[PDB]
Short mmCIF file of all heavy atoms in Angstrom, two decimals:
data_model
loop_
_atom_site.label_atom_id
_atom_site.label_comp_id
_atom_site.label_asym_id
_atom_site.label_seq_id
_atom_site.Cartn_x
_atom_site.Cartn_y
_atom_site.Cartn_z
N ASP A 28 29.59 -135.12 77.06
CA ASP A 28 30.92 -134.48 76.83
C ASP A 28 31.11 -133.36 77.78
O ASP A 28 30.25 -132.44 77.75
N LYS A 29 32.13 -133.29 78.61
CA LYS A 29 32.37 -132.22 79.53
C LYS A 29 32.81 -130.94 78.87
O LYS A 29 32.64 -129.95 79.44
N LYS A 30 33.41 -131.07 77.72
CA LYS A 30 33.92 -129.85 77.00
C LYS A 30 32.79 -129.09 76.23
O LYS A 30 33.09 -127.93 75.90
N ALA A 31 31.70 -129.76 76.05
CA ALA A 31 30.67 -129.13 75.25
C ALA A 31 29.97 -128.03 76.05
O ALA A 31 29.62 -128.19 77.20
N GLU A 32 29.81 -126.83 75.41
CA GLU A 32 29.05 -125.76 76.03
C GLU A 32 27.53 -126.09 76.11
O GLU A 32 26.87 -125.79 77.12
N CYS A 33 27.06 -126.72 75.01
CA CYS A 33 25.65 -127.16 74.94
C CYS A 33 25.66 -128.57 74.47
O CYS A 33 26.04 -128.85 73.26
N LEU A 34 25.21 -129.49 75.28
CA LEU A 34 25.20 -130.93 74.98
C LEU A 34 23.98 -131.30 74.16
O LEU A 34 22.85 -130.91 74.52
N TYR A 35 24.16 -132.04 73.08
CA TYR A 35 23.10 -132.51 72.22
C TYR A 35 23.05 -134.06 72.18
O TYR A 35 24.08 -134.67 72.04
CB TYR A 35 23.24 -131.91 70.82
CG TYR A 35 23.11 -130.43 70.74
CD1 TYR A 35 24.24 -129.66 70.86
CD2 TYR A 35 21.92 -129.81 70.58
CE1 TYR A 35 24.19 -128.26 70.84
CE2 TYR A 35 21.84 -128.44 70.55
CZ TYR A 35 22.96 -127.65 70.65
OH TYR A 35 22.85 -126.24 70.60
N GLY A 36 21.82 -134.60 72.27
CA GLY A 36 21.67 -136.02 72.15
C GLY A 36 20.49 -136.32 71.17
O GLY A 36 19.93 -135.44 70.61
N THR A 37 20.25 -137.64 71.02
CA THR A 37 19.21 -138.10 70.12
C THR A 37 18.37 -139.12 70.82
O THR A 37 18.93 -140.00 71.59
CB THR A 37 19.76 -138.59 68.80
OG1 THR A 37 20.34 -137.53 68.10
CG2 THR A 37 18.70 -139.31 68.00
N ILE A 38 17.02 -139.09 70.58
CA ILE A 38 16.09 -139.96 71.25
C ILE A 38 15.28 -140.72 70.21
O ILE A 38 14.96 -140.11 69.16
CB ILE A 38 15.19 -139.22 72.21
CG1 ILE A 38 15.98 -138.42 73.26
CG2 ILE A 38 14.16 -140.14 72.85
CD1 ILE A 38 15.21 -137.38 73.96
N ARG A 39 14.98 -141.98 70.43
CA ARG A 39 14.12 -142.78 69.63
C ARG A 39 12.92 -143.24 70.46
O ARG A 39 13.16 -143.84 71.53
CB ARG A 39 14.82 -144.02 69.04
CG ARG A 39 16.18 -143.66 68.46
CD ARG A 39 16.77 -144.83 67.68
NE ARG A 39 16.23 -144.89 66.30
CZ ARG A 39 16.91 -144.53 65.24
NH1 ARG A 39 18.08 -143.96 65.38
NH2 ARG A 39 16.32 -144.59 64.05
N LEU A 40 11.75 -142.95 69.99
CA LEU A 40 10.49 -143.46 70.62
C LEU A 40 10.09 -144.80 70.09
O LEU A 40 9.76 -144.86 68.87
CB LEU A 40 9.36 -142.48 70.43
CG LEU A 40 9.21 -141.26 71.33
CD1 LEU A 40 8.95 -141.66 72.79
CD2 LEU A 40 10.52 -140.36 71.36
N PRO A 41 10.05 -145.83 70.87
CA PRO A 41 9.61 -147.16 70.41
C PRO A 41 8.09 -147.24 70.49
O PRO A 41 7.44 -147.02 71.54
CB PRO A 41 10.25 -148.12 71.43
CG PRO A 41 10.83 -147.08 72.55
CD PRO A 41 10.02 -145.90 72.32
N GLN A 42 7.48 -147.58 69.33
CA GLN A 42 6.04 -147.50 69.09
C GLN A 42 5.57 -148.78 68.46
O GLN A 42 6.34 -149.51 67.83
CB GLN A 42 5.61 -146.30 68.32
CG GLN A 42 6.19 -146.22 66.93
CD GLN A 42 5.36 -147.05 65.92
OE1 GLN A 42 4.18 -147.15 66.05
NE2 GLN A 42 6.01 -147.53 64.86
N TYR A 43 4.28 -149.07 68.59
CA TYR A 43 3.73 -150.31 68.08
C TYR A 43 3.67 -150.27 66.57
O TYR A 43 2.82 -149.72 65.92
CB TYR A 43 2.34 -150.47 68.64
CG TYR A 43 2.22 -150.55 70.14
CD1 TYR A 43 1.44 -149.70 70.87
CD2 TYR A 43 2.89 -151.53 70.81
CE1 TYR A 43 1.33 -149.77 72.25
CE2 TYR A 43 2.85 -151.61 72.21
CZ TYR A 43 2.07 -150.73 72.90
OH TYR A 43 1.96 -150.80 74.27
N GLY A 44 4.75 -150.89 65.97
CA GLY A 44 4.87 -150.90 64.51
C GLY A 44 5.98 -151.87 64.12
O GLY A 44 6.60 -152.53 64.94
N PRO A 45 6.15 -152.03 62.81
CA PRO A 45 7.16 -152.92 62.30
C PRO A 45 8.59 -152.46 62.48
O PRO A 45 9.53 -153.17 62.08
CB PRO A 45 6.81 -153.06 60.84
CG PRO A 45 6.22 -151.67 60.48
CD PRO A 45 5.49 -151.29 61.72
N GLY A 46 8.87 -151.27 62.95
CA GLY A 46 10.22 -150.84 63.21
C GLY A 46 10.24 -149.61 64.08
O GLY A 46 9.22 -148.96 64.33
N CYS A 47 11.39 -149.32 64.63
CA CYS A 47 11.60 -148.23 65.51
C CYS A 47 11.54 -146.94 64.64
O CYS A 47 11.88 -146.86 63.49
CB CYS A 47 12.95 -148.30 66.25
SG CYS A 47 13.14 -149.78 67.20
N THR A 48 11.15 -145.82 65.34
CA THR A 48 10.97 -144.50 64.65
C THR A 48 12.40 -143.93 64.37
O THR A 48 13.39 -144.25 65.01
CB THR A 48 10.20 -143.56 65.51
OG1 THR A 48 9.79 -142.43 64.74
CG2 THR A 48 11.03 -143.05 66.69
N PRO A 49 12.50 -143.12 63.33
CA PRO A 49 13.80 -142.38 63.11
C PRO A 49 14.11 -141.42 64.30
O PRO A 49 13.17 -140.88 64.86
CB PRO A 49 13.52 -141.59 61.85
CG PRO A 49 12.05 -141.53 61.73
CD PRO A 49 11.50 -142.74 62.29
N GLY A 50 15.40 -141.38 64.63
CA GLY A 50 15.78 -140.65 65.80
C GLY A 50 15.52 -139.18 65.67
O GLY A 50 15.60 -138.64 64.54
N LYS A 51 15.16 -138.55 66.76
CA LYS A 51 15.03 -137.08 66.87
C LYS A 51 16.07 -136.53 67.82
O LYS A 51 16.30 -137.10 68.90
CB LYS A 51 13.58 -136.77 67.34
CG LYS A 51 12.50 -137.33 66.55
CD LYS A 51 11.16 -136.74 66.90
CE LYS A 51 10.99 -135.38 66.28
NZ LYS A 51 9.59 -134.81 66.48
N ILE A 52 16.68 -135.44 67.41
CA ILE A 52 17.78 -134.81 68.14
C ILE A 52 17.20 -133.81 69.14
O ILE A 52 16.14 -133.28 68.95
CB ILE A 52 18.81 -134.14 67.23
CG1 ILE A 52 20.10 -133.84 67.92
CG2 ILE A 52 18.20 -132.87 66.61
CD1 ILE A 52 21.21 -133.35 66.97
N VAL A 53 17.90 -133.60 70.29
CA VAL A 53 17.48 -132.72 71.31
C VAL A 53 18.65 -132.21 72.03
O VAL A 53 19.81 -132.75 71.95
CB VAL A 53 16.59 -133.44 72.39
CG1 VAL A 53 15.21 -133.97 71.79
CG2 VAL A 53 17.31 -134.54 73.11
N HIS A 54 18.50 -131.04 72.69
CA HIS A 54 19.54 -130.47 73.56
C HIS A 54 19.27 -130.77 75.01
O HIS A 54 18.11 -130.61 75.43
CB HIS A 54 19.61 -128.89 73.32
CG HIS A 54 20.44 -128.24 74.33
ND1 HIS A 54 21.68 -128.71 74.75
CD2 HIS A 54 20.28 -127.03 74.99
CE1 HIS A 54 22.21 -127.91 75.66
NE2 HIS A 54 21.39 -126.87 75.77
N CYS A 55 20.26 -131.15 75.76
CA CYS A 55 20.13 -131.61 77.12
C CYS A 55 21.08 -130.90 78.06
O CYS A 55 22.09 -130.37 77.56
CB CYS A 55 20.32 -133.13 77.26
SG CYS A 55 21.88 -133.71 76.59
#
């Protein structure tokens, strides 16, 4: 988003297991 002063996203780490990890938010 170009209007955002501080842009925030979310990342999921895929790991050896029966499902993907819950997402973690980050500032970019």
Side-chain angles (χ1 to χ4, degrees), residues 31 35-55:
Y35 297 90
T37 291
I38 302 165
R39 316 191 81 100
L40 276 294
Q42 63 84 30
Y43 299 123
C47 304
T48 194
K51 305 190 76 170
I52 195 170
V53 298
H54 170 40
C55 57

